[PDB]
Design a protein around this ligand. Structure first.
Ligand SMILES: Cc1ccsc1-c1cc(-c2ccccc2)c(-c2nnn[nH]2)c(N(C)C(C)C)n1
Length: 130
């Protein structure tokens, strides 16, 4: 929709703190911090696919809105994820071991803006069309 396309990371704030709050160790935080990923979003019928591509790490999720699915995260957490559409915004929650984190994806002007929250820590990443 507003979301379909190939998106390149152009800015990031508080990503190290967000990863620390998730309990991620130094080596994996170093890798994730210096990564400069592209995000490819596509839709076919009921199914949305989000591909992440970077020099040292690739990931992919596919899902139907409102339907819980199993996901392996970049840092190797095994989580249960649910993604819904609320007022134009894609809202994702990941649940594991009694914990949760939220990831919201929104379109604003020329930007894809992503906000990630874990407890008291908020991270913001911005992507533009490749
Ligand atoms: C490393 C790590 C540890 C705990 S979370 C995490 C992580 C890693 C990446 C990543 C993916 C590939 C290349 C480099 C980093 C992204 C990401 N950034 N852009 N696309 N995926 C991400 N975000 C929350 C996502 C949902 C926006 N979280």
């Amino acid at each position: 929709d507003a979301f379909v396309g190939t998106w390149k990371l152009v800015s990031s704030e508080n990503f190290d703190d967000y990863m620390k709050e998730l309990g991620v160790g130094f080596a994996t935080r170093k890798m994730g911090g210096m990564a400069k990923p592209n995000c490819i979003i596509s839709v076919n019928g009921d199914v949305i696919t989000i591909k992440t591509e970077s020099t040292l790490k690739n990931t992919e999720i596919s899902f139907i809105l409102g339907q819980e699915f199993d996901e392996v995260t970049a840092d190797d957490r095994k989580v249960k994820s649910t993604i819904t559409l609320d007022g134009g915004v894609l809202v994702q929650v990941q649940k594991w071991d009694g914990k949760s984190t939220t990831i919201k994806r929104k379109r604003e002007d020329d930007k894809l803006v992503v906000e990630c929250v874990m407890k008291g820590v908020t991270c913001t990443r911005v992507y533009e069309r490749a």
